[model samples]
Target chain A: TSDFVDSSGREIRQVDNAMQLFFDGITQNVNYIAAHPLIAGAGDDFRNYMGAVATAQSENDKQATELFASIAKAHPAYSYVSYGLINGSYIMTPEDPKMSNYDPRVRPWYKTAMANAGKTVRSDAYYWANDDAVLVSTIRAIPNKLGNPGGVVNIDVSLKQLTNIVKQIKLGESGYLMLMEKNGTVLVDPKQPEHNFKKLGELGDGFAELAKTGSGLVELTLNGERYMANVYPSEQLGWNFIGLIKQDEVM
Target chain B: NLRDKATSDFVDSSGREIRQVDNAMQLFFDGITQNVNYIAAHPLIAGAGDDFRNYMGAVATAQSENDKQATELFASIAKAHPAYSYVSYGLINGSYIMTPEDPKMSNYDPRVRPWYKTAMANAGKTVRSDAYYWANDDAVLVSTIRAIPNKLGNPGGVVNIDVSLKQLTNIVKQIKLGESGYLMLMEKNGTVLVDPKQPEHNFKKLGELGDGFAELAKTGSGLVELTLNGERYMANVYPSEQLGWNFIGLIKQDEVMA
Candidate 1:
């Protein structure tokens, strides 16, 4: 019983940690940026965006972009990095000005940063309504100080790498890996795209327990067959990583 | 053989320096006012439309020179205001949104700093800070700070402008009255902050010069006539209404008809 559960939990936690680590890499320099001063119309020439667009005369933002550029060079997964300042200005890498009537200050991420005080915030993965790209974002507020009106910083990434890694998971025969948000929305994985976004309740019996369970061993019954499932929630992401094994195969 | 108007004749002109400081402040506030409104009016943030589709479209598609705009907005503000070493936006989370500091790195938090506290406590209004040394420089820098509303509907951030006499001296050195007539700035304590012949006259406590010099340094602001650098001169002092400092206009006795 322990071996079946131990193996399952270990793999689930592994996948969850792997996802967490990716975000950790993107926000590694958050404190560094926060430590600096908040100046409006601060400009820079370091335009090393891997995919995002750079707008006109990035003001009050160069050091953070410099730090982000280095991250882009090392971690190509970063699709784009942006900041919405208090001076009604914007900052992005790989400059592009195609969108009509675009303003970073009026966007959701900016509002979210302003809503939250001082912490790294992760957004739900979605097909970005703007570009239709499967994207997820992490945001941090460069809070106000003295008389300077500070802004928020954000980083966007594609699901490419995370999907590739999720596809690598293997358990016993008939076993499969699963991931879902804290609120029960299933994430896209080995399952058909149609199966994506489905909740555990729709997947028949045994999943309901997994949903209510914490990070530990649990007995599961799928399609009337016995199995062992590990519920590993990615604490930082508020998502669960599940590793399941069929009864006969593990035995 | 005298020339030019006396201190009484040009008293209003001497106050022009103080007015320049006021103009600089107006520009600073103008920028921050627009910024606060812009950030707040975004349909994604509040006060307008909050369509998920429309909001995500703007955010995900991203914008060009997103960082550039803020950088330029701030860099221009710095250039527009002399003696301004750094202009910053302080957020509720102890973050400093700043310019000219991009190339440099530091761990300085402005939360406990005097200007920050004053802005926080004063909230919604611009507050002037007392004179003090810039942590990294020599000039006695004074700060003007105004806090903005954050998403929490509280005093969340600030528009911080630091005026160090860095470039102020450059302009002060250019001021002229008659031959051998120039202006100087001093603190309430009589310490000379900016003198046309600076490096030689800097930090000289005019209080030691006695008479009206000591009187004006303490509180009064009027005649402070003196003879210096081997010449007799008539001195007039005008106090800065905003910073509570003093400005001295020197006119050569040879240029004044008594």
Candidate 2:
């Protein structure tokens, strides 16, 4: 049963081994955004201000937004990036602020980022309430001169975009890859509309065992057909990278 | 750093408990499956006479002998793994035999039972019955029924074994993720199988826990970040491939983030 042959008649345990590199690519890019001098310098820039009234000057400058927009444009994988100031002001790239009540302080990511100050933190995957797409936000704290909280920077990546990166990884003719949070929430799938954002528990069995084992193969039956899934759990992103192919197709 | 230590310790300890619980259930499942097959293959059940009068007397005699063997089988297996409630055999002609034979089964009709019907339908296969609440014992249970075919390859009898979820419930109850963390098990259809803190709430719909549970169970095993009762916890879920069941372990967000 361990023997699996692809369309080319080549024996392979997995069709794609590039999934780890894809996840690594994201981490490196996120780290690049985290270490950008502008973000790292924001803390020193805001150190002089004990308190600032909401002046027209504060909202007028799109410099922060423009910088983030440039970052997004440079990295096609990123949906958007934004800077959040202690003054409760936010400047988002690509300038889509449909929600008028946006406040970074109230967001769980901001609170945790500030509390775990100085390091980058990743938020749990969630549907972008406005766009209804699965995404995870990563936040890094911008510290004051005296090492106090001054500002925060964050970036968002769509699960759909993540899926597109690994979508071509075919196990066999109909086999495909799926992305999920460590807790079973479907981030992306070949059949996205029906499965996206749903938990693996809801979809059926074999998935949970994958999570527990972290990286390995398990035999699972679906719709009366047996399947072999190779599951890889990323410690960096806390996500599960799974490759599923029909047993008959592989055999 | 202190928080990391706490989180690390919690995950390791929690993982051990989950593995123990999973192992216990799997062993019980494997052992019972094997024993049931053994009982079904017995000459008495598989070769009983078919003429109604002769069949009745033959079954009666077989019942006495089978009961002795079944009693030993059930007792030894139950002692080896403490998850079984009982093991029994039901003949097509209405001959009932079991170990720890209960008074209540005297009038029980195994022919019309779901386990019987489902097993008969499958004929030569071993079928696991959907979980149900046994009101008599106030226990949530599932039965595995295997049809024992006659000499001519027709349905002659069935072997049924009931497994109590009491051990599973206790495992969930004792698992402590953090100050406010708890564990749960739910089926694919969103039915709550086990809730450690609330046994009376078993067999309830997923709506009682939240809509997310129903959604998550479909995803199988993985992790989900959730906010329950206004507090956030990182929930780790795993599915039992053999039983169509899911297990969830929740740890407080602060404990993890710290």
Compose the digit string of candidate 2's lDDT tens values, residues B1-258: 876666554554454345445544554455456546655665555665433111233233333544455445445434433455767767777666555555334345567777788788887877677677666568677788898776434677788878766755754565555566677877766677787766655787766556344444445566666665456666777677766777777777887765
Kindly list the per-residue Cα lDDT of model 1 for residues B72-114, writing each as its tens digit.
5456545534335776665555444456744343555566677
Residue B5, model 2, lDDT: 60
Question: How high is the CA lDDT of each candidate model?
Answer: 0.56, 0.60
Name the regions of candidate 1 deviating beyond 4 angstroms: A33-71, A105-108, A144-149, A169-176, A191-227, B1-258
Tell me the interface RMSD of every candidate, in Å.
26.2, 25.8
Tens digits of per-residue lDDT, candidate 1, A1-251, equal 77566545534443454455445545543433344444222433222222244443443345545544543443455677676666555555543444344566666666776677667687776555566556566777765532233677777775654555466555443567777777776675564444456676666567676767767677878658888777777776788877777777767
TM-score of 1: 0.40
- Residue-level lDDT tens digits of model 2 in A40-69: 445323211123432233323345555566
iRMSD computed for candidate 2: 25.8
Which residue ranges in model 2 land beyond 4 Å of their true spot? A1-251, B1-20, B49-82, B103-107, B151-153, B178-180, B208-219
